[PDB]
Amino acid sequence: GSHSMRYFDTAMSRPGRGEPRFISVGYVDDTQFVRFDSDAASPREEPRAPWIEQEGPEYWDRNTQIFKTNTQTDRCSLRNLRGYYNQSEAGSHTLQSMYGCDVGPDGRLLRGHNQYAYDGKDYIALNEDLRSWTAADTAAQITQRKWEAARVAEQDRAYLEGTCVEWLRRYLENGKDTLERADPPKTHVTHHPISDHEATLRCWALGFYPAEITLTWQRDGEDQTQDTELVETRPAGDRTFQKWAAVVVPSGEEQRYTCHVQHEGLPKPLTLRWE
């Protein structure tokens, strides 16, 4: 199938409580494989998946160094951003970063990503061309001009087309028994009367990986998007995910409702009814 490698970095200032915390987490698809936290007793790049543990001591030593350097760069960025927005030294602010690569079934680059948000708002992003930037506002235009002057897009393009795709291919090979295995959902429909007139039908999906799933209710073959309560997909804590979808139905009309499930792990899509 298609795969992604992504690092999710958070830097958060805390005036009066030391320097900004930096945390970086790496994922292959929906599987975390590394973490760095500047607040850890002895900050190290640490393994968070079994197939990474084999990498060897230089993997750990140099990744630890790249993360410690990234801690300092994100603190520099937070100082600059406070200035660009004319903000006081009193407030806490957040810088987030997403970067990495997507590959197709043959391991070929599909697209690269390098984007940033400040206080939860999009700030700047590398365009799909990997050559040019999109800046959200006149503050991000300063970063854009600086990065154009320093030819940063060229460095990012070389990382995303070379190192990123090469490491993702090696992780997929080393973790093939888990990262290349789709676990289908286990499904059931529950029924709870709410009154004499109405009942809740709830369509369950449990134990699936990866997290991407489609769960719908239909009434007489018509999608019920507006009348369905769909909970966010949630982690079980054992690598797999859960989700449910519920509709309130008139008593006696339960068999007009079908729950439809699509997921990569299923040999074919499921149609479920109550009982």
Partner: peptide, 9 residues
Amino acid sequence: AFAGKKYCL
């Protein structure tokens, strides 16, 4: 050949 270097905004 390791995780990504960042640049200051």
